[PDB]
Amino acid sequence: RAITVFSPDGRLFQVEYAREAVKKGSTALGMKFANGVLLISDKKVRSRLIEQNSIEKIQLIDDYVAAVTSGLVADARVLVDFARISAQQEKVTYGSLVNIENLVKRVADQMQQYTQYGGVRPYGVSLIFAGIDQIGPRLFDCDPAGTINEYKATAIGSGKDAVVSFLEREYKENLPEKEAVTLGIKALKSSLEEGEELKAPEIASITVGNKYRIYDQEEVKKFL
Amino acid sequence: RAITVFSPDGRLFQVEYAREAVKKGSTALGMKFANGVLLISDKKVRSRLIEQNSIEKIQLIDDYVAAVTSGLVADARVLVDFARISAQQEKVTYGSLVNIENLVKRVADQMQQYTQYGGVRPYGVSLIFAGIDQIGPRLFDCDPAGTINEYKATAIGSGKDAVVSFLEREYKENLPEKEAVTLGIKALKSSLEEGEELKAPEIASITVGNKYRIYDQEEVKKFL
Amino acid sequence: RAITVFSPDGRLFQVEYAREAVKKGSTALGMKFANGVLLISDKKVRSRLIEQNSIEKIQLIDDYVAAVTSGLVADARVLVDFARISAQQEKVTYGSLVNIENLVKRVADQMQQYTQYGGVRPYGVSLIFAGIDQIGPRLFDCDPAGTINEYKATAIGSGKDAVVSFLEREYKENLPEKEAVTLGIKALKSSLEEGEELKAPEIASITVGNKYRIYDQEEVKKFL
Amino acid sequence: RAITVFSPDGRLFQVEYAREAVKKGSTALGMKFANGVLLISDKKVRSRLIEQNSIEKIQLIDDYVAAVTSGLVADARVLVDFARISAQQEKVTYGSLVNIENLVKRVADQMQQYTQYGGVRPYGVSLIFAGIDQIGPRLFDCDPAGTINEYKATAIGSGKDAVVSFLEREYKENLPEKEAVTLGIKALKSSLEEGEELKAPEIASITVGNKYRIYDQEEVKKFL
Amino acid sequence: RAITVFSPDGRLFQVEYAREAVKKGSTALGMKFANGVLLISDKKVRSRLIEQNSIEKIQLIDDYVAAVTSGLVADARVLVDFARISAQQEKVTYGSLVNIENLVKRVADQMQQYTQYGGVRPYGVSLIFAGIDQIGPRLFDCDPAGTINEYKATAIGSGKDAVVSFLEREYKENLPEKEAVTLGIKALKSSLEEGEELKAPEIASITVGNKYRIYDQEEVKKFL
Amino acid sequence: RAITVFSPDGRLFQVEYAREAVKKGSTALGMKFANGVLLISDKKVRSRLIEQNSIEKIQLIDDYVAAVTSGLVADARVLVDFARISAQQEKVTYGSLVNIENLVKRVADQMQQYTQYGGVRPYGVSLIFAGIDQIGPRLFDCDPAGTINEYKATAIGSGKDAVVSFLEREYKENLPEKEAVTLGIKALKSSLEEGEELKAPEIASITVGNKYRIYDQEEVKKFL
Amino acid sequence: RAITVFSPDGRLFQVEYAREAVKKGSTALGMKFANGVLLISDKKVRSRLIEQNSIEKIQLIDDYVAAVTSGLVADARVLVDFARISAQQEKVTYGSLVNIENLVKRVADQMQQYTQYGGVRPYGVSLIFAGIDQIGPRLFDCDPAGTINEYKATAIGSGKDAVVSFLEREYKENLPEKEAVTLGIKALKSSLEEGEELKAPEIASITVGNKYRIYDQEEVKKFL
Amino acid sequence: TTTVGITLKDAVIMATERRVTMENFIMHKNGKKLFQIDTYTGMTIAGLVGDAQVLVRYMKAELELYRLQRRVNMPIEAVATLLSNMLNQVKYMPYMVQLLVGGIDTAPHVFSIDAAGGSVEDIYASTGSGSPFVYGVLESQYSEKMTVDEGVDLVIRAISAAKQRDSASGGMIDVAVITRKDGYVQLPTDQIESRIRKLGLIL
Amino acid sequence: TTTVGITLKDAVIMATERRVTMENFIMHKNGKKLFQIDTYTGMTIAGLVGDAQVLVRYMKAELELYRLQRRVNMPIEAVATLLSNMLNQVKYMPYMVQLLVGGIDTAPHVFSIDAAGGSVEDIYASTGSGSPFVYGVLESQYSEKMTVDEGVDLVIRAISAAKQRDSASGGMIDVAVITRKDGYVQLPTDQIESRIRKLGLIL
């Protein structure tokens, strides 16, 4: 019953409340490895009546860059499409999306705007972009505040604190893909796995030199 | 006496209150079957003075895609027409509505907008789109939050939880039309049928290869 | 001291308060009969100083479609004129107002807009459109919420519940005009007639094949 | 400390409060007579320092139609000029102000708009238009709500209830001008004349076939 | 902590509060006389450091019309300039400012607008226009409400009630200039002169047939 | 927690609160003398780390007109630049800034606007313009209310009341520059000099016939 | 629960609350030296998982001007880019960014705008610009209020008061680069070094005659 | 049509004839081409009547407004620059006119203004259809050491000459002299026609 | 109309004649085409007066404002650039003009600017109707080893020549020499005409 303004202690309560919404989001993470980067999200399903795969959490922005999101689903979708067309835009003017960092910055600024322009609720979502650009494999995360940072490995959603600590500890610099996906899935497990069953995780990866690869049901089940 | 903003726990109360309105809506469901998909709504009538059929709950968007809605009637109507013209739009530019998923996404985004743009009340309605597209028979549902998901079978309105559980249990994958409509009507019955009489349900279906078919009074009465 | 938003139970209180205003409106009804439809409103007059007929409650939209309204008089007038020009519009583009249902839908949507667009009070009025179109004699009613339905017979205003029940009971399907107007006037009487005197009702009718006919003082007094 | 919205009982309190302002306005009335209509307002003056006649309460819209107003003076003036140009507009397009009823309807709608368009205070004024049109001598009144009605005779301002009742009783249908102005002035007297002195009333009239005539000081004093 | 809306008793409190500001303004008056009109304001000065005459209270709109104001100084200035250009406008289109009454009406309407258009504070000022037009010497006054009246003599500002009563009593119809300025200065004295010293009044006058004349220091001191 | 509107006693509290901000501003003054005018501000410095002169309080608008300000620094800067370009504007259209009074009036009106246009905080600053124009040496001051006055000598900021009284007493009409700057610096001293040390004052002056002269460190130290 | 308006004591509480946010920002400082200026920020890192250098706090605006910021990270970024393009703008019109002071003024004004334009939260950030322009090496700082000042040396962020005092005391005018960076790092240490470890500071410098130089990991570690 | 502004000692004199024509069809015998525009300034119109007249009104007002707000009369070069700005600002859809604005502030002035906002001051200049002819006689007999009376005659002569060699010009020639002493004063028709007769001129 | 800007050692000289004409009708004998635009810089106008004038005022005020805001004077190349941008920006409805801007910041400079915002620096350059003629004598006698005094003469000669072969040029030729020491100084009319006489030139 007040706003998006500064509290007496220098905080945007609205943006905080927003952050809450993301914590209650599913858990996902990613990390750079050998010569690429991978993304992995916990695909926690309910009814037999849901159309399985259709609930894709790892979404492509373009053949060389993907992102995974956490928070208000609706907000995540619309913010994804924005990045998609925004991506296309850089391609059509310059002829090539040279720096991915830039792609995230644009979408970040979009979110930052609702942080101060009065009459409008902020984007209740956080997400991470992963892919390989002119500079190489890159990993970024972004929160409802528009804050953006590049990582070596990270997570987001519900079990962030948990999974992040595991990595913080057992993360291995230049871990080759097979072992990297493993460490990851292990890390994802521990975290959200207060409820034992890891269920069916959604995992995809890309390596310098080529396009993204989405792991098939059986392949992922192999590490599961 | 406050808004569409985030609560201290990360929730859009307005969108919640909206959801309430839909629960108080009539009950309807649908499911994919053999080589098509069917829709069925409970047409609960009151006065002898109402013009029967005129109160059509299952509405066509185009000869190959229909949708049924639940919530504030007015809101449902206007949101239907939007999808209709929106459908036409894709047809006139591309020459063909190739992916139905896309149609629902547009209408969903429409609803998502009122989720954050300050001065305007959200759409108090949920609905499901069913039809066969380039990909095949498809089933989607959408809530006032703009959240959208694809199903194998589902329901909405008043007796959602109930009917959904029945299916959740007795839903048969590739059930041929005749048996599918049956399972459905049975499922619809159990649910809302705390009040015994199923009355006159409204049912329609389409099968890959051709246009939609609306069941006639007698035909439906046959399964009733 | 709050709005047009959803209450914790899923209701638009403003639209409700609006409905109240219409209940306090005069009573009127209509019904389909033989091969046409008729409209009848209770013309309750006060002073000798009022210009009698000038207080016409049944208004024409065009020679083949009329409507009668109940609620905030001002709101009713402006909403009437909108339908009038809106009617003209369909005539000038398509060359003919083929489906009357459509006319009401447009005016309904107009009302539905004020149901959600923030800063603006809803239309405190309900009305019914009656006439014969390409499809035949048609009867519709509309409330401040933008909800619209087609009837075989119905009423609106103050004594709705009452008169409606009478019809609900003694309504005769294909009653020939003379008997239909009678049943109607009888129904109107019972209802508002807690105060005995029916006064001078305002009645008009149209039959397939021709234009609307407004009953003259003596003719109506004949059934009175 | 709330609005222009509907109260729990279906009322626009703001429009009510507005009505209050008009009651506290001066008293005036008019009535149709023989073959014309007349207007009469109580010109209650204070200081010797006021420029007498300059405080004209009966204002001309055009040589064949005049109006008198009651309520917030400022609001009345601006609303008068609107009708004036609005009058001119019909003249310049159609070549002739055929129906005066229409003139009042436009100005009424103007007022009705502020009845619902959020951020703006309604017009705190009521007025009556009198004149002879294509149809003949016509008399209308209008309130802050935008409600408009045609009379045989009526009043407005402070002593409405009073003067109106006198007429309600002693109004004579086709009273010839001389007697009509008398009945009027008598009626005006009784009403506001709790304070004995009628002072100097302002009276004007028009009769079918010609333009309006404003009574001169002596002529009015003759009936006084 | 509420607005510009109607109180339960039919009053615009904001406009009232505004009036307060004007009472606390300096005192000035004017009156028609022989064959012209004069204006006189009490020029109450403080410091030796003020630039004397520069604090001109009687301002010219054009060589034949002047005005004096009372209330929030800033508001008065801006409202003056508006009248000035507004004056010029009538001159450039019609070729001549024929009726001064009209000039004041425009500026009045300007003020009336802020009386109802929501988000904006009214003009906290009252002023009087004096001059000779096509009709002859004319005298008008205007308040923050946009109310305007023509006088034979009047005052405004702090000692209005006082000075006005003196005139109300001893005002002499066709008093020749010399005697008129006297009666005036006497009237101005009595009023504000609770504090004995009249100080140096500011006086100017115009007479039919020619332009305005501002009295020089010595000339005014002659009547002082 | 309310506005820019009129209090029950006729005051714009917001504009008052604004005035407060200016009192807490540094102290400065100016006065007309022999054949020019001078400006002097107390340059109270803190750290050794500040870039001395860069904190110029007396700013030029153009070679013949300068101004010094007091209040919210930011607000002062932006309001200065406005006057600067505004100055340029008069130069480019008319070919010469003939009357400086006009320059201040424009900037004053700018400030007056925020005094009533709803959603926007007033300019928390007061300033004085000094220079020689077509009319001669001129001195003006302006407050957050948009009120403007011409002086023979005056001050503003913190020690206004004090310094002003000294002048009010010991101000010498046609004091030649050397003595004028002295009287000034003496006056400035007494006032703010509750804290003994006058520090390093900032002083500049201009004399009819030529451009402005900013006193150099040593020259000012000479009077110090 | 109120605004950006003036408090009864003349203060913009919102801008204050904003200042709070900046105090909680990292610590950084800069100072002019020999024939250039240097910038140094405390790069306090957490996880092994962060991409080291990517978290650059000292950002370039152009090869000859850099700036470092403190406060809400998002706000800082967007405000940086604004200065960047704003810089480019001056280059493209005039052909050369002659005065850096001007660059900061523009960005300052940007911030000042949100200080009064109603519906929008101020920029919760402070920053300092450093570089060499046509005038020479220049050092400026700016706060959320839009206040800007030029220094000989200064700091900002968390340990401002501390580090600033050290300099205030031990700052050496024309200290040659090597010694200047030392004094600086020493000053930075003392301040934030309540927690002993200085970690890895980020330092860069430029000297008249050439472009900016960012110190490499080892070089900085040399002074560390 | 022909107008002329001439500067001398402590005065400025402006005069024009007044025939308004439509090609060869001289439709109006008594137009007005000389206008007072401020206490100490006048202007002469030449070109299309529509554009000139509206232009005169704007100027007239713009000046009065300026006087009131600034408490002092607008300087001549200022009025000329103002005008210059207006005209050039719309050069691509110009007021097809040619203006001469004379007056006296600190000293006498006279500026020539074209449809593109080109403004230039001279000691005298002529404007209009018959310009050449007058420029002929002025070039021949004007002297800065003339008396205001000599001036008024020279001018009449100048116009009467152009009236002879230019069918577009004609009718009663009228003059106004503006001095700081008396201000802008237009000479009495009779007195003018008197000087004509005396000079042995015609019309 | 002819104007010329010339560079030499530690100064820049700029001069123009001053006849303003309408085809063959020489209407104004004393127009002004040399304008100081900033303490250490001047500009020469050439082309359509209306455009030229407004352009000059814009440039003047713009320069003054910048000086105040930046506390330093705008560099010559910088002011050239600004002008360049303005002009080109409106190439399709241009200010039909040709500008020459000279001044001295860290060194002397002179830029030729065309209506399409083309801007180029030379060691000297002429602008106007008589450009070729002056370009002749300059191409024949200018030497970067000349003194400011030799310069002023050269310039006077060149323009004088153009005056002989170009009916569109004429009137009193006037010069202004700008140096860091004294700033922008316009030579006195008598001294100019004195040099003319001494040189055996005319007009």
Side-chain angles (χ1 to χ4, degrees), chain B residues 64-215:
Chain B
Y64 299 62
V65 50
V68 62
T69 192
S70 180
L72 282 299
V73 46
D75 285 28
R77 178 182 72 250
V78 51
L79 216 61
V80 164
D81 275 326
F82 172 80
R84 275 177 171 170
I85 84 179
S86 180
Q88 290 314 326
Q89 287 183 185
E90 178 153 348
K91 289 190 162 188
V92 78
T93 117
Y94 291 93
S96 180
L97 170 34
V98 42
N99 193 331
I100 173 169
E101 171 187 343
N102 214 263
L103 168 59
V104 56
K105 274 188 178 183
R106 192 167 185 246
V107 60
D109 290 349
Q110 231 299 92
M111 302 166 83
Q112 183 287 141
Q113 278 191 72
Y114 297 59
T115 293
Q116 72 188 322
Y117 279 112
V120 69
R121 163 186 84 61
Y123 282 100
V125 35
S126 286
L127 28 51
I128 65 184
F129 301 92
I132 164 258
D133 74 343
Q134 190 82 146
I135 305 182
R138 313 206 63 185
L139 180 62
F140 294 93
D141 86 327
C142 195
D143 72 333
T147 311
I148 163 195
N149 307 96
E150 180 160 36
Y151 295 72
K152 186 91 237 297
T154 184
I156 202 63
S158 188
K160 181 179 181 178
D161 302 284
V163 58
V164 72
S165 299
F166 180 140
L167 279 325
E168 175 71 285
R169 167 178 140 248
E170 293 196 283
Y171 174 70
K172 211 72 179 179
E173 186 71 5
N174 296 123
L175 199 57
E177 189 174 271
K178 195 175 182 186
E179 300 191 33
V181 35
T182 300
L183 170 54
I185 188 177
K186 188 180 171 186
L188 171 66
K189 220 175 194 301
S190 54
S191 175
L192 214 293
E193 277 32 79
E194 179 274 317
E196 166 60 41
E197 193 181 41
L198 177 50
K199 205 59 183 177
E202 197 179 307
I203 167 194
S205 59
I206 183 175
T207 170
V208 73
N210 47 278
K211 311 165 83 173
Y212 249 106
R213 169 178 132 243
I214 291 185
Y215 282 43

Side-chain angles (χ1 to χ4, degrees), chain C residues 1 47-48 77 114 121, chain D residues 1 109 115-117 146 168:
Chain C
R1 348 217 9 155
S47 174
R48 313 181 292 134
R77 178 182 72 250
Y114 297 59
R121 163 186 84 61
Chain D
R1 348 217 9 155
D109 290 349
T115 293
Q116 72 188 322
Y117 279 112
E168 175 71 285

Side-chain angles (χ1 to χ4, degrees), chain H residues 10-12 40-41 76 102-109 178-181 183:
Chain H
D10 284 331
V12 49
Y40 295 119
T41 153
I76 303 302
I104 172 188
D105 48 25
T106 188
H109 296 291
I178 122 190
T179 171
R180 197 58 183 285
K181 167 80 177 178

